[PDB]
Design a protein around this ligand. Structure first.
Ligand SMILES: O=C(O)CCO/N=C/c1cc(Br)cc(Br)c1O
Ligand SMILES: O=C(O)CCO/N=C/c1cc(Br)cc(Br)c1O
Lengths: 115, 115, 115, 115
């Protein structure tokens, strides 16, 4: 699994479950093309978005739909979504974990990159 | 001043100076139209981007050029940029400060919305 | 002013107002001795804790009473307090700003060290 | 396993490996007594600190030795350590994951608490 997403909720101290995630890849004409999508599980994780073969070099955007998550908990948050944009596999294949820690008016995102 | 940006460097414990910042407004055709831009000051701040008159309700994006910042420091970064996407709302407080705390493989962003 | 504290609330997107903050110095017997304290202002800031004359090199602890802050908002928190422990050094810049970004089950802290 | 620690490095985008962790528990005389200790693994994780039987209600302090970690990478960081202080098991047994994301002049810590 070369691209994984993990989302945590900093208000509740829990995984952020059922968070929609959309992944896009920049095309040769410089526009964002759909690449994969899914929803976080009960553990706040999203696996199985892509394969090593499909996950070629490129610029990828991982959009985490945080606004819908908070609205469903009764909270009107600040951001529309959290966007994570990065070049992938430009020095050969890697495994990426994109993690996000969510609060209504703040989020943090990190990447863990392994061989 | 209704919209300010503050950028900090978590590696050096300092303001992030001379970071390019672009602000976009979402247009009716769903595309991002340039709105304002600048470079952070020696205090890591960018003021004077817009006026109360111009900063009407809508969806805005603040794009912080983090990749060029880390490249100048000789540190290999993960993200192409940091993106902050939000709705400006007239029902809340009048000043929006978008703050970002930068590391090579991580960033945090918060919104401080005050009167 | 060589030591300042700034506290933000990531749930409300606001300064964290009226938060108690205690500063301690490590004594020669390795115990923490009270040094200075106060409550954050309406801007979430606490200034005037010490002077350049008093703020000699040593190990200091800044304890932010986050539990009482969340209790006042009716939100169940995880931590008893946030603790920031550091060595003050005369070889670096002269002003230390200890910033903290608070959520019920998470906090971030950074140091902005400037001239 | 009711108490786990996970540490990430925000500069390198990797687990923080070989980080020393000391856990203390407040005794009836209000002093911190040693409770458990260990080091993070190649995955940045520390398991096996305690058992459900031993991990009774109390106030616990998890001290993550961040300064030694950074010094070994050639970096002189700001903090002496990251301290996480919390009441545990006061509404029955729970499972706690204490996570920390490290940068030289900043860290964030969250808790994931499960039944
Ligand atoms: O395994 C679990 O239950 C959660 C532990 O993983 N933590 C991830 C994580 C932690 C912090 Br602190 C900041 C960011 Br951004 C993260 O993505
Ligand atoms: O006075 C200064 O120099 C700036 C201090 O403000 N801190 C802001 C801030 C702190 C943390 Br922790 C995380 C995020 Br995101 C922030 O935006």
């Amino acid at each position: 699994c070369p691209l994984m997403v993990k989302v945590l909720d900093a208000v509740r101290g829990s995984p952020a479950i059922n968070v929609a995630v959309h992944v896009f890849r920049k095309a040769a004409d410089d526009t964002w093309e759909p690449f994969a999508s899914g929803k976080t599980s009960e553990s706040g994780e999203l696996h199985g978005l892509t394969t090593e073969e499909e996950f070629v070099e490129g610029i990828y955007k991982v959009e985490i739909d945080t606004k819908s998550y908070w609205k469903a908990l009764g909270i009107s948050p600040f951001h529309e979504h959290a966007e994570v944009v990065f070049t992938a596999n430009d020095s050969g294949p890697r495994r990426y974990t994109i993690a996000a820690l969510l609060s209504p008016y703040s989020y943090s995102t990190t990447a863990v990159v392994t061989n």
